[PDB]
């Protein structure tokens, strides 16, 4: 099975090819911008994005739309992290959380899978929380300044192997996997 | 640093050292021939090539395999598209296209990349669709047939700069680079 992976982050094919691929499964990336909405919920975006893109690119394809939720920032960056990412960046989410009480938040990844005339919604939540400071350089995005929970390193400090082993995308791939095991075959 | 390119194309070879090289890092031809095993996935034929390398040349080392996958004929030629090329040729292709109205294609290349007892793939994938006559005299191989997403030519008809702009090669070279990057002293 060969799934397209409508995408421009090279961060995520690396992860999603990687844990798919140990499953003999093929992801081949094909950049192709889509609307993003607006909304209150990723599986929004996702939505939108899927009934945009079907009949424009090859089959299966998925798409994956994820973001930073941060506690004391009531939900911020979330669905808008990839602007807040490009414009007051981790310096802007380091200089928001000074003297903050309270810096848990949870990452989120939501994939968006077609088929057939059938579109799906897989996700995963990691919760943990915001460090002081940027550290590691794996991983892409937010990854320097987010700590998963039971963890003591960042995102950054750690392989994609042990990233994507406790990530929210891991666990969106994992819920993905466990449904493809029991309807396609692969 | 220095890294061992398992190969005896020397175009690729140019096409590699040039680019790894702009960031200080010594590409070394090396030819050592190697299996490459028949498959659907550039992947598993990378796969094989590192593991069977393994120990037979100096580290660290990389190889690398790409081909044009045609989606109306479901797949077909990609891992086999020098054989394809040498035998039934362009003319082959566009036999087989007569009245094909969707005639969407990919390149896909795929470098494998060895060290420190681990190996690691890297890809890059460029879009386009197969045109309908041959055109263009530049490059090689499929050149002459494949229009680039984006673009009204064919490679054939584009310079080696326009080209290489959209290369999958050159996409899953930069991939290579930010791993290197990120991984490696030098
Ligand atoms: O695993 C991750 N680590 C760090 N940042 C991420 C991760 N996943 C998504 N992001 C960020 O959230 C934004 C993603 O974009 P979106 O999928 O269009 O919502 C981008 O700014 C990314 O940098
Ligand atoms: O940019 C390209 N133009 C034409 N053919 C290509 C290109 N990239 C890969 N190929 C085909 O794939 C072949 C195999 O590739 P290699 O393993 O990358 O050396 C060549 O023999 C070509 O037939």
Do not use: C
Not at 41 to 59: M, N, Q, R, T
């Amino acid at each position: 099975m060969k799934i397209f992976f409508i995408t421009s982050n090279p961060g995520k094919v690396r992860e999603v090819a990687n844990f798919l691929g140990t499953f003999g499964i093929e992801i081949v990336q094909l950049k192709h911008e889509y609307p993003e909405i607006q909304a209150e919920k990723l599986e929004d975006v996702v939505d939108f994005g899927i009934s945009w893109l079907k009949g424009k690119v090859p089959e299966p394809f998925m798409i994956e739309d994820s973001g930073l939720f941060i506690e004391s920032l009531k939900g911020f960056p979330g669905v808008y992290s990839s602007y807040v990412y490009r414009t007051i960046g981790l310096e802007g989410i380091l200089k928001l959380m000074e003297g903050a009480e309270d810096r848990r938040a949870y990452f989120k990844s939501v994939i968006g899978f077609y088929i057939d005339g059938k579109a799906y919604k897989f996700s995963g939540v990691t919760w943990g929380r915001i460090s002081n400071e940027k550290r590691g350089t794996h991983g892409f995005g937010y990854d320097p300044i987010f700590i998963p929970e039971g963890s003591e390193k960042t995102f950054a400090e750690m392989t994609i192997e042990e990233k994507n082993a406790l990530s929210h995308r891991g666990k969106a791939l994992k819920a993905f996997f466990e449904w493809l095991k029991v309807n396609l075959k692969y």
